[PDB]
Amino acid sequence: IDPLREELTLESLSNVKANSYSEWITQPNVSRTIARELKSFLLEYTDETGRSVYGARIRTLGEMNSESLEVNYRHLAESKAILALFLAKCPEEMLKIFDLVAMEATELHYPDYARIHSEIHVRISDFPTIYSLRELRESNLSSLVRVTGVVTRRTGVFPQLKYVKFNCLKCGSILGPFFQDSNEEIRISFCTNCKSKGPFRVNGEKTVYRNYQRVTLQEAPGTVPPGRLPRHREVILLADLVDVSKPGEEVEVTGIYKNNYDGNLNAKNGFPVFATIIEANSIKRREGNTANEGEEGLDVFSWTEEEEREFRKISRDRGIIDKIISSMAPSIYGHRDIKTAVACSLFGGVPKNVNGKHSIRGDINVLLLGDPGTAKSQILKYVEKTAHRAVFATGQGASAVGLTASVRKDPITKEWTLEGGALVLADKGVCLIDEFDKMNDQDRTSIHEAMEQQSISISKAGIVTTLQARCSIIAAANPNGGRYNSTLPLAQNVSLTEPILSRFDILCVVRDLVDEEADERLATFVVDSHVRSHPENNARQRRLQRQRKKEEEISPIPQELLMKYIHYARTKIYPKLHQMDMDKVSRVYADLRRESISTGSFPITVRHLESILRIAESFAKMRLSEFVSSYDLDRAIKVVVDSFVDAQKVSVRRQLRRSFAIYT
Amino acid sequence: AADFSLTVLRARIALLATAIGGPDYTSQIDPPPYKLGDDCLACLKDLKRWFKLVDDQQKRWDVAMAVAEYRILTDDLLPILIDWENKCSLAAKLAKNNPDHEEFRNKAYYDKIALNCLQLLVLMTWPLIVTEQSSSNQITLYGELKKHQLVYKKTILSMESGKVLRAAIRLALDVIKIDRLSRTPRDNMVLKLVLNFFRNVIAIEPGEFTINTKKSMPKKGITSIDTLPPNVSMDDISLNTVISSFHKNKVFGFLLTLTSSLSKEFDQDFINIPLLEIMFYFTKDVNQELLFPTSAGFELSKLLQKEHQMRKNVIKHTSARHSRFGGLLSIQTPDKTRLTVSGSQALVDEKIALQKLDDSKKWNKRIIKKHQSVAAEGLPNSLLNSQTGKAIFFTESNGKHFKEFINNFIDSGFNILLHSVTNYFTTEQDRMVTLEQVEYLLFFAWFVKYQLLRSKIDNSADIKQVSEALKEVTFILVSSLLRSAYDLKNWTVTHAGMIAFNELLNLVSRTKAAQEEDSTDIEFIVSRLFSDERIQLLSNLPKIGSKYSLQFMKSCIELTHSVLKVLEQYSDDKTLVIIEVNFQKVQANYMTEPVIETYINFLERFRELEDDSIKKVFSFFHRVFVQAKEQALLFRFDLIILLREMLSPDGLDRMSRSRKYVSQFSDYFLARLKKRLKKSPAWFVGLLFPPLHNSEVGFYQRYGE
Amino acid sequence: SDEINELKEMVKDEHIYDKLVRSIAPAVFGHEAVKKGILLQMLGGVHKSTVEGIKLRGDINICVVGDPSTSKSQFLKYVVGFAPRSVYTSGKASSAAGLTAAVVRDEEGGDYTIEAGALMLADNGICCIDEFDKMDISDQVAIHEAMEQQTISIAKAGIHATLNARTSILAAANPVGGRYNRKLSLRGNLNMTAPIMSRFDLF
DNA sequence: AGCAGATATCACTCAGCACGA
DNA sequence: TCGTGCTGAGTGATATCTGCTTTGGGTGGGTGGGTGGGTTGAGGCAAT
Ligand SMILES: Nc1ncnc2c1ncn2[C@@H]1O[C@H](COP(=O)(O)OP(=O)(O)OP(=O)(O)O)[C@@H](O)[C@H]1O
Ligand SMILES: Nc1ncnc2c1ncn2[C@@H]1O[C@H](COP(=O)(O)OP(=O)(O)O)[C@@H](O)[C@H]1O
Ligand SMILES: [Mg+2]
Ligand SMILES: [Mg+2]
Ligand SMILES: [Zn+2]
């Protein structure tokens, strides 16, 4: 038997006989044992359900033509503790072996996958320990670390030489290709054959290129101590990792802590100090996901095939829309009109492009004009948590170019450049503007183009460009005087102008009135919620079970399942209108215009007919239906008419409600 | 081919290492206990077979490197031995509680595994020697294997406070449990194995820094000479740690028991040489003066004062103003020519001006030094090459333990050990290699000198414990060794014999001081040892000393001093017959230009010597100048320059008796030189040059008449 | 061990609650009502979070109104030097930061940077504001979110962040007129609007 | 033009022996 | 054991050739840095 082909066992693998972990892993027999154990873990691991998680993951990976297999660290730790320890201590060689064993499990399912992607990368999802850029020390060198920060700066994607080939200047012999480290340059000093002190011209008949990118990771403002300067690190993103993190975002970086010799560093400091970097292994978008940190996986909004089947099963239910509405902010007692609007905005409409000449917005904007203590900021926070991409801004905390896009001079290239804003960051998402009425006029006026054209136009310092802002806006405002005056028209209760008001699809007026029954019910619900949330009131499985039991009381649908459902519906569902009552909608629009002719009333234009259609599309989308039904159109008509009626005065509200009773 | 075979060898030895065994983590008891594998004994036997069939017969050392790479020793053999020793200790405690109580199964198998482990330990710890015929592979792996040996020694002395020493002691006591007649050759082999293990543990030490000389050394030069491994410090492998471990594990008691019953209840053939080697390696690097000296604070204050005086003397050479002050001096020669010097001290002083003039010169005359690597001859580092003054810094408790052990050995079995070794070696003289000669001579010299010093300090313990040195068998053995070493031009054995002879002469002088009537039998020895050939040899030694290392010089000097001392004392006391001894003839024999040259050379290095060496040198000079009236010898310029250096304020401390000797000699020498110069102006010229050898004028030069 | 015995002795006292009120700011004379408010603010309330990431405030805000030379400042001074985390400031803040956060850009190349404010610096502590009735317009609007949502949201050129402001505000204000007019209601005597007035737990 | 590294060709020291003294 | 060469290869050493690079300025770059210099004018932004 060839000794190089013999293998040890797991308990013998635990016992280390080398001077270092890397030397132990690199040994032939140990490497074979590790590869065999990793393959066994990938093939045989089962979850609580009992199905192979990684088999389905590999199937999905092959279906989408991707080159990254996500492996949860906890699964490996429970299944194989020693392998998890090796991965934590020696990420490099362990990751190499893991990558090899993954293209043999992918190839197991798709035999000819090598013709699509040559190699497959393994990405670690949930490293148990999280560090700050301040906490990094020398003891973390050459070991896997998990850090969080802000992407301050970014480079363009460059092709980097995977393998470097050298040829002697003198002799002319061409040395074999050598592995290019991501961190620092590879050079040949001593020639095997020539033995020449002289340098080698670097030449190669054929070279394989690799995607390369570098970012400047900075401590997030939230985590840095107040009033202290942030610390930063340089993160290197290799192939398949490029462009995943965009400047200004908050991310969690899983990578290898590496050091290298820097001459200028030494020169400047006067001590033998080594530069440090991070080799990114995995990136998780933490932006707007502070309250979602309790979940697992690189993306909490992604779904599996079984979850898709569950989504279909849920959608087939008749009362899906009612459950979805009831599940919006379960801790808020009532306001079933502010929950319906929020759900409609979250799901959104279908943008349309007629013959390539006419562009129609497909997003829904909502405005909350109400009393001081009617749970508006909490609703905005919930929307931020649930939405896939959300941005939160305050009244005076937002500038006219902090929203939209701004122009700066690039520190490196000394040239004018373009930066994104709130709107940009909220592309295909939601922008939340609390304290809308306290906004500066200038600031307010900025969003006019963005809210309808879904685009940002910039003409500054020789920069002539148009961006994409396909973001919905939900805003909370306080009526003039600090309290709504139901006697006066809507226009006199707020300082907003006709265009901005017209740009809002749904208006939700919130009134605080003293009523014995309403006060009793609201107080009872608030007290019950406060008692429910008291901190005092397997171990992980037990915690999840008790959390699920607590959630079941107030929400018919799990919150995480709800977020996944919303993301799936937005991504994969585009309803269309083919059968609909033209006369009904036309008459509703005409009646709305006739009733809105009154001075000081809520503005009505074609925008609101389009908003009726958009809300019908959104209601159809809530059921994962490919076609808008008559019921959805009726519901949208009822919503719009109810909002319009509620926006009126006390004196004429009864007459308006009696007149419009047919549609509602 | 070779690289692939190396890879296969490493893989197979790694598999063997992983198959030997390891700790059992299943048990909840912590720290976990070591568990033996299914084929532990077979694995050890296979490892020994690999050692025999690859390391030796094929003249390579790849097996040892492979074994060291995978930590077979520090992780498998030492834990196995320690666990077995602990099991035996528990069994002994149980027997104490109840002799019939037993807690052992497969005792034979455990003993077999322990014995094989000890054998493999001895194999791995055996001294490494590089010869001229050693293969390229052996030459290339010398340093790495020496570093691995250092790691092995550190682990042996540290792990569990060194319980493997107790395991080896138990293995030896197992053999001791059976009578001498009942002792089979296997038992004697086990005893020799244990003694060799102890000798190897003591012997190991850092190697040399070998550098290729093909190319003249670069402009960068030598950075540092470090042979230590990464995580090993000199504190772990020093003799202090060895003494601590031996005292803790009662190794000293076992060795004393073996050496006290030597040649009575044991077979001496197996045990005599290992004991001698053990003791030589014990006492090779130890200076006996240190053993007979808070006091540390007092010595620190004295040393600080000494450094303060040195700095004060240095201060006169430093300018009060900064360097760029820019003072220029012009000094007028006896002829009207002006030389330029820079520095405030130049303006304020003249001697400083001439010293700077000298110092500023760029041209250097080549100095060629004949350096011999000790590793070339296979010898270990010892007093022969160790720099003078190199002191082993013992702790108080460790020093007390070492002194007690040496005293007990000298009072118990030094006589018998010396007798047995001398008999065995004189029976087998020709088969001696250089190492054995140096070892025997150094051991004899060290122990004799230590006993002399202790007798001086303490009136109880006396010369009768080392009286076996006087006996003629040992004396003739030493004389033959030294004479043969001289004749064959083996300078290291020459040096060892020199040291041994110096100690023997000091001993005989003390015995004569003891009692004359009882020392008639030693007058016999004195007559025998001062044979004309021997006289000649002893005289020749100094003449050649100048060519070799400093230590050679010092030994030459000391032996000369002892020879003259005994000669003068025994000529004054009585008459001597070898051929009657004419002390004046010998004296005259001692008076030539090479001797003086040697002396001068030795004295040039006066900043490292003690006061005793200077005292001996100047006693010799007094003999030359006054007693012999051979003054022409000393009318040289090397002596004048060196004496200026000695008497200068920066040279020697004012508060010193050495300076007193130097000042007295300088006064006498200057007086006589002035008288001679007043007589003969020619001597001004003469000073510069070696003596003339002309029948006509030679006498005139030499004696002035 | 000795400290534990003292701790158990204190809780064993029947009149413990009264003594703590009387042991707050002993320099001040005859203001037990204000002392009880300060003691409760230091203890605070339990911070709770619902099952969908909605946070419920657990900090107590106190506003003290009084005529000039009534020991209003003395109460703030004692709290500053006693509580673990605390900051002393005034509504008319000198710094460009003010109560809340502000953005400053090193001139040229260097990008916009966040400068901490009074509320930021006192995170997880108590921020004492000497003159609440003189805060800047910017701060007045800005402080809406800090007192309830416990966060500061900024969206300026090239920088956007949410800043933790989990603090308890202990503010001192003067009557809108020269002295407190007993005839008018508390709302009339104060320049504060209805929204801010609701965010204060005690007056 | 000046400076730092390197090659290669230039001597000098200890080495030792034959004659005779 | 001195004197006088003759032999001698080893161990130097010093007299002697082979390749950068520079100033400063974009006729070396922005994966050399901006605390090693240049650097006044226009432009956009926030606090005011
Ligand atoms: N009840 C009191 N007990 C002790 N000292 C008091 C009391 N009331 C007022 N003082 C004294 O009033 C002096 C001035 O009052 P303080 O500095 O506390 O602020 P204030 O004048 O009340 O407030 P502001 O600066 O807002 O007008 C303090 O030095 C304090 O000694
Ligand atoms: N309908 C409601 N159901 C449950 N809690 C409510 C309701 N209305 C108000 N609250 C509570 O009162 C507080 C209202 O503060 P908030 O809504 O942030 O102020 P604003 O309405 O000015 O944004 C919240 O902490 C919330 O818990
Ligand atoms: Mg609000
Ligand atoms: Mg005050
Ligand atoms: Zn080559």
Tab-separated table of C-alpha atoms in Angstrom, chain A residues 221-222 226-227 248 287 291 329-332 372 377-378 381-382 385 391-399 401-403 406 408-409 411 419 422 425 435 438 478 482-483 529-530 532-535 547 550-551 554 559, chain C residues 46-57 105 108-111 113-114 116 120-123 137-138 141-142 144-145 148-149 151-164 166 187 194-195 198-199:
chain	number	residue	atom	x	y	z
A	221	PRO	CA	-20.821	55.624	13.642
A	222	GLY	CA	-23.163	53.580	15.766
A	226	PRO	CA	-19.090	58.953	21.087
A	227	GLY	CA	-16.662	61.717	20.181
A	248	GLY	CA	-21.776	54.276	2.283
A	287	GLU	CA	-27.446	48.416	6.263
A	291	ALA	CA	-33.193	44.696	14.171
A	329	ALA	CA	-46.727	46.217	13.149
A	330	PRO	CA	-48.579	43.771	15.434
A	331	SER	CA	-47.587	45.760	18.540
A	332	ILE	CA	-49.611	48.787	17.371
A	372	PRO	CA	-48.328	63.671	18.426
A	377	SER	CA	-42.489	56.813	14.192
A	378	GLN	CA	-42.927	53.222	15.372
A	381	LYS	CA	-39.324	51.915	12.186
A	382	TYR	CA	-41.263	48.726	11.449
A	385	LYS	CA	-37.057	46.745	9.510
A	391	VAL	CA	-33.211	54.465	4.630
A	392	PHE	CA	-34.375	56.573	7.582
A	393	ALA	CA	-34.083	60.357	7.709
A	394	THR	CA	-35.345	63.104	10.006
A	395	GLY	CA	-36.737	66.465	9.169
A	396	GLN	CA	-33.848	68.821	9.595
A	397	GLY	CA	-31.268	66.125	9.590
A	398	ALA	CA	-31.535	65.720	5.881
A	399	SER	CA	-30.083	68.186	3.325
A	401	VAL	CA	-28.170	66.912	-1.657
A	402	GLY	CA	-27.916	64.382	1.206
A	403	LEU	CA	-31.055	63.116	-0.413
A	406	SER	CA	-24.018	65.240	-4.365
A	408	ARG	CA	-17.334	66.274	-4.443
A	409	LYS	CA	-13.664	66.344	-5.454
A	411	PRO	CA	-9.115	62.908	-2.821
A	419	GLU	CA	-22.021	60.398	-4.716
A	422	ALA	CA	-30.804	58.621	0.635
A	425	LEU	CA	-29.480	53.964	-1.351
A	435	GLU	CA	-40.847	64.995	10.805
A	438	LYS	CA	-40.171	70.356	9.893
A	478	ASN	CA	-47.606	66.885	12.233
A	482	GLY	CA	-49.389	70.611	16.686
A	483	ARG	CA	-52.905	69.156	16.492
A	529	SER	CA	-47.682	44.348	25.019
A	530	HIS	CA	-45.430	45.859	27.690
A	532	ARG	CA	-45.157	40.535	26.837
A	533	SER	CA	-41.868	42.294	26.016
A	534	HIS	CA	-40.407	42.159	29.532
A	535	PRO	CA	-36.811	40.870	29.190
A	547	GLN	CA	-40.088	33.440	20.771
A	550	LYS	CA	-44.810	34.882	22.027
A	551	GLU	CA	-45.127	36.022	18.406
A	554	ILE	CA	-50.241	39.103	18.082
A	559	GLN	CA	-42.229	38.157	10.814
C	46	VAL	CA	-36.891	48.716	32.388
C	47	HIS	CA	-35.937	48.925	28.714
C	48	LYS	CA	-38.079	46.601	26.599
C	49	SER	CA	-38.177	45.558	22.949
C	50	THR	CA	-41.196	43.988	21.264
C	51	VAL	CA	-41.160	40.835	19.121
C	52	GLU	CA	-40.695	42.734	15.832
C	53	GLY	CA	-37.892	45.166	16.654
C	54	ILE	CA	-40.000	48.042	18.006
C	55	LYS	CA	-38.274	49.647	20.989
C	56	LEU	CA	-40.088	50.970	24.060
C	57	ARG	CA	-38.359	53.771	25.947
C	105	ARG	CA	-15.541	68.512	6.664
C	108	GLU	CA	-10.807	70.108	0.526
C	109	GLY	CA	-10.335	66.335	-0.310
C	110	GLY	CA	-11.283	65.155	3.135
C	111	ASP	CA	-14.850	63.978	3.345
C	113	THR	CA	-17.156	63.819	9.367
C	114	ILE	CA	-19.476	63.440	12.346
C	116	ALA	CA	-20.486	64.407	18.672
C	120	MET	CA	-24.446	61.744	21.960
C	121	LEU	CA	-21.727	62.185	24.537
C	122	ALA	CA	-24.188	61.420	27.354
C	123	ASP	CA	-25.263	58.115	25.791
C	137	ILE	CA	-34.523	75.774	15.966
C	138	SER	CA	-32.430	72.985	14.556
C	141	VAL	CA	-36.725	69.883	15.693
C	142	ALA	CA	-33.799	67.491	16.088
C	144	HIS	CA	-37.969	65.344	18.735
C	145	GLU	CA	-36.488	62.000	17.683
C	148	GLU	CA	-38.533	59.254	22.064
C	149	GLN	CA	-36.818	57.146	19.383
C	151	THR	CA	-31.678	57.968	17.887
C	152	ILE	CA	-30.322	60.779	15.730
C	153	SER	CA	-30.732	60.375	11.964
C	154	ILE	CA	-28.641	62.541	9.632
C	155	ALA	CA	-28.510	62.480	5.822
C	156	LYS	CA	-25.970	65.120	4.611
C	157	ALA	CA	-23.660	65.265	1.534
C	158	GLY	CA	-21.857	61.948	1.428
C	159	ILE	CA	-22.642	60.861	4.934
C	160	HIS	CA	-25.692	59.133	6.403
C	161	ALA	CA	-25.947	57.506	9.813
C	162	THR	CA	-28.172	56.682	12.773
C	163	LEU	CA	-26.616	57.729	16.078
C	164	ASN	CA	-27.530	56.255	19.454
C	166	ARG	CA	-30.193	56.569	24.782
C	187	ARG	CA	-48.478	75.678	29.026
C	194	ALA	CA	-47.316	70.428	22.776
C	195	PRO	CA	-45.098	67.749	21.140
C	198	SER	CA	-45.647	65.390	25.997
C	199	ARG	CA	-42.183	63.803	25.830
